[PDB]
Amino acid sequence: RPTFYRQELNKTIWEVPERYQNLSPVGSGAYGSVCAAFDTKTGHRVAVKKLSRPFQSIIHAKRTYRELRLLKHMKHENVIGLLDVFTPARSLEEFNDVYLVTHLMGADLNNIVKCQKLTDDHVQFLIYQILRGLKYIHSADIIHRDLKPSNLAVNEDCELKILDFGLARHVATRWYRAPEIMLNWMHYNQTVDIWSVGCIMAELLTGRTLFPGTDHIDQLKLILRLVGTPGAELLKKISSESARNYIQSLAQMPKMNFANVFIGANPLAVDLLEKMLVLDSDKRITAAQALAHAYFAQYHDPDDEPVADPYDQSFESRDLLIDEWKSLTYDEVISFVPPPLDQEEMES
Ligand SMILES: CNC(=O)c1cc(-n2ncc3cc(Nc4c(F)cccc4Cl)c(COC)cc32)cs1
Ligand SMILES: CCCCCCCCO[C@@H]1O[C@H](CO)[C@@H](O)[C@H](O)[C@H]1O
Ligand SMILES: CCCCCCCCO[C@@H]1O[C@H](CO)[C@@H](O)[C@H](O)[C@H]1O
């Protein structure tokens, strides 16, 4: 067991192994409190996330366990991977905080969009890597649920990682959200992530948020103006008469031509945007289909787009006591095994 030390940053107390040094706050979030740190043992800067009140309620406790299970499973070049998990607690009875450690990426997608207008080649590489990481996530039967520029980060080589997963089931931007998640459809496809990819791609191409809604209804207003009011084939899948009547009541809007909306963009990029930003989620392109799209010809390698090991999420169906959730989380903390040092990290 390492020795821990305590320290106050922006009004939150941080207790961490002495290996972590120079803690600097990166952000304060609904997800948790995040601080940049330097790891003396690896010589590498790290991002440390402290779980906010992990066991305050059954919902928070299950969510804590969900996040730890998720992140422990993720081993992919374009997905956040866990370098460390720890708690200052010496026993389960004392267990009340969880800290998660990952490599610190150089920049957020939002910072990159502000910093420069991306080249089409840069857009192809960044979106290719999101879809590559996404193929892996969906292969484990996981929906990320919260792809957005601040959950995407790159290094100096524009190598990209997908970060914090959406932990809601059954403060937080609605701009990249799929319309069905807002409308409470309740049987979400993995395609909701593809809708979020399409929103991000548009923004990388134009420099501007595609759908910057001011509130919930405005968000859907802006979406329908681009993709149009729902088609007959979609109206067939909606049971409520009142919901159908309201859509019929709305002034009919034709889907806008993407070629005009994204004019000056690569035509292949516009074609791919059309296949992502479809209202009907059954008709959105999948991550694996999108990686074979001609727009990614320069980067596509069918033999280097790996898939995930099976992910046991039978826990999602459990209703357990708060003490069981806390206890299962503690077991996962105890059993965590750090990944090995990279070859590039060692010498002769
Ligand atoms: C110079 N560098 C910069 O400015 C930036 C670096 C990053 N960056 N790099 C890695 C990273 C990981 C997380 N989440 C997290 C974590 F901290 C620890 C464990 C697990 C997880 Cl999911 C967050 C929080 O996202 C809301 C931001 C992160 C973003 S801007
Ligand atoms: C008031 C106009 C809102 C339009 C929202 C679309 C209606 C979505 O409503 C959804 O329809 C699904 C299929 O019938 C059902 O399975 C879901 O329970 C229901 O929420
Ligand atoms: C009609 C109000 C505007 C929102 C349109 C979103 C339609 C998304 O598409 C829907 O996704 C559902 C799963 O979430 C599927 O069950 C439906 O079959 C599919 O049509």
CATH of the domain at 86: 3.30.200.20
3-state SS assignment for residue 333 = helix
User: What's the DSSP call for residue 343?
Assistant: G
Tell which residue, 109, 191, 214, 78, has the closest CA to residue 145.
191
Question: Residues 117, 94: one domain?
Answer: no
User: What's the DSSP call for residue 84?
Assistant: E
Residue 346 lies in a domain: no
Question: Does ligand 1 lie within 6 Å of residue 104's CB atom?
Answer: yes
Helix, strand, coil % over all residues of the chain, rounded to 5 = 40, 15, 45
Q: How many residues can be counted in the chain? A: 348
Question: Residues 193, 52: one domain?
Answer: no
**Within 10 Å of residue 321's Cβ, how many Cβ atoms?**
10
**Within 10 Å of residue 343's Cβ, how many Cβ atoms?**
7
> Alpha carbon of 175 to those of 20, 136, 144, 147, 267: distances in Å?
35, 24, 15, 10, 24
Residues 6+ apart with CB under 8 A from 237: 280
Angular region, 50: left φ>0, alpha ψ -120 to 50, beta rest: beta
Print burial letters for 211-224: b (CB count within 10 Å at least 16), e (below 16). bebeeeeebbebbb
Q: Is 30 annotated as a binding residue?
A: yes
Structurally, the chain folds into a number of domains equal to 2
**Within 10 Å of residue 281's Cβ, how many Cβ atoms?**
19
Question: Residues 261, 317: one domain?
Answer: no
3-state SS assignment for residue 54 = coil
Residue 302 lies in a domain: no
Q: How far apart are CA 348 and CA 203, in angstroms?
A: 45
Query: Token match 């080589």: residue?
Result: 157
**Within 10 Å of residue 289's Cβ, how many Cβ atoms?**
13
Name the residue of 28, 49, 50, 146 to mutate for ligand 1: max ligand atoms within 8 A of Cβ. Answer: 49
Query: Which atom, in ligand 3's list, is nearest to the CA of 282?
Result: 19
Q: How far apart are CA 23 and CA 39, in angstroms?
A: 10
Checking DSSP bridges between strand 44-51 and strand 99-103, what pairing results, if any? antiparallel
User: What's the DSSP call for residue 8?
Assistant: E
Query: Token match 């395609």: residue?
Result: 191
Residue 147 identity: L
Q: How far apart are CA 131 and CA 321, in angstroms?
A: 37
Checking DSSP bridges between strand 44-51 and strand 20-28, what pairing results, if any? unpaired
CA–CA–CA angle 309, 314, 316 (5° rounding): 115
Tell which residue, 155, 166, 165, 164, has the closest CA to residue 126.
155
CA trace torsion 16, 21, 26, 32 (10° rounding): 0
Tokens of 295: 């727009």
Do the Cβ atoms of 204 and 113 come closer than 8 Å? Answer: yes
Question: Residues 127, 51: one domain?
Answer: no
Question: Residues 215, 319: one domain?
Answer: no
Do the Cβ atoms of 216 and 298 come closer than 8 Å? Answer: no
Helix (H) or strand (E) holding 103: strand 99-103
Tokens of 303: 């033999």
Residues 6+ apart with CB under 8 A from 128: 291, 296, 299, 300
Name the residue of 234, 237, 240 to mutate for ligand 2: max ligand atoms within 8 A of Cβ. Answer: 240
Breaks in the chain (C to N over 2.5 Å), named by the residue before each, are 170
3-state SS assignment for residue 22 = strand
Helix (H) or strand (E) holding 86: strand 84-86
Domain extent for 330: 4-104+309-336
Tell which residue, 2, 13, 8, 76, has the closest CA to residue 39.
2
Q: How far apart are CA 177 and CA 144, in angstroms?
A: 11
Interval between CA 44 and ligand 1 midpoint (Å): 14
Q: How far apart are CA 73 and CA 321, in angstroms?
A: 24
Q: Is 33 annotated as a binding residue?
A: yes
Q: Is 207 annotated as a binding residue?
A: no
Question: Does ligand 1 lie within 6 Å of residue 49's CB atom?
Answer: yes
User: What's the DSSP call for residue 315?
Assistant: G
Q: Indicate which technique resolved this structure.
A: X-ray
Residue 265 lies in a domain: yes
Question: Residues 98, 162: one domain?
Answer: no
Residue nearest to atom 14 of ligand 3 (CA): 188
Instruction: For residue 155, give the ligand nearest its CA.
Output: 1
Residue 191 lies in a domain: yes
User: Hey, which residues are catalytic here?
Assistant: 164
Q: What is the DSSP string of 261-296?
A: HTTTS-HHHHHHHHHHS-SSGGGSPPHHHHHTSGGG
Question: Residues 238, 172: one domain?
Answer: yes
Residue 345 lies in a domain: no
Interval between CA 202 and ligand 3 midpoint (Å): 21
Residue nearest to atom 16 of ligand 1 (CA): 49
Residue 344 lies in a domain: no
Backbone angles phi, psi at 66, to 5 degrees: -55, -50
Name the residue of 216, 281, 283, 285 to mutate for ligand 3: max ligand atoms within 8 A of Cβ. Answer: 281
Tokens of 316: 């999602």
Q: Is 228 annotated as a binding residue?
A: no
**How many Cα atoms are found within 13 Å in the side-chain-facing hemisphere of 243?**
11
Instruction: For residue 247, give the ligand nearest its CA.
Output: 2
At how many Å resolution was this determined?
Answer: 2.3
Q: How far apart are CA 222 and CA 50, in angstroms?
A: 36
Instruction: For residue 180, give the ligand nearest its CA.
Output: 3
Tell which residue, 309, 307, 313, 287, has the closest CA to residue 67.
313
Backbone angles phi, psi at 304, to 5 degrees: -135, 40
Question: Does ligand 1 lie within 6 Å of residue 102's CB atom?
Answer: yes
Do the Cβ atoms of 59 and 49 come closer than 8 Å? Answer: no
What is the rounded end-to-end Cα distance, in angstroms, of the chain?
A: 30
Do the Cβ atoms of 135 and 291 come closer than 8 Å? Answer: yes
3-state SS assignment for residue 328 = helix
Residue nearest to atom 1 of ligand 3 (CA): 230
Task: List, in sequence order, the alpha helices (H) in the chain.
Answer: 58-73, 109-115, 120-139, 179-183, 191-206, 216-227, 232-235, 241-249, 258-261, 267-276, 287-291, 322-335
For the sheet containing 44-51, what is the strand order? 20-28, 32-39, 44-51, 99-103, 84-86
Residue 324 identity: E
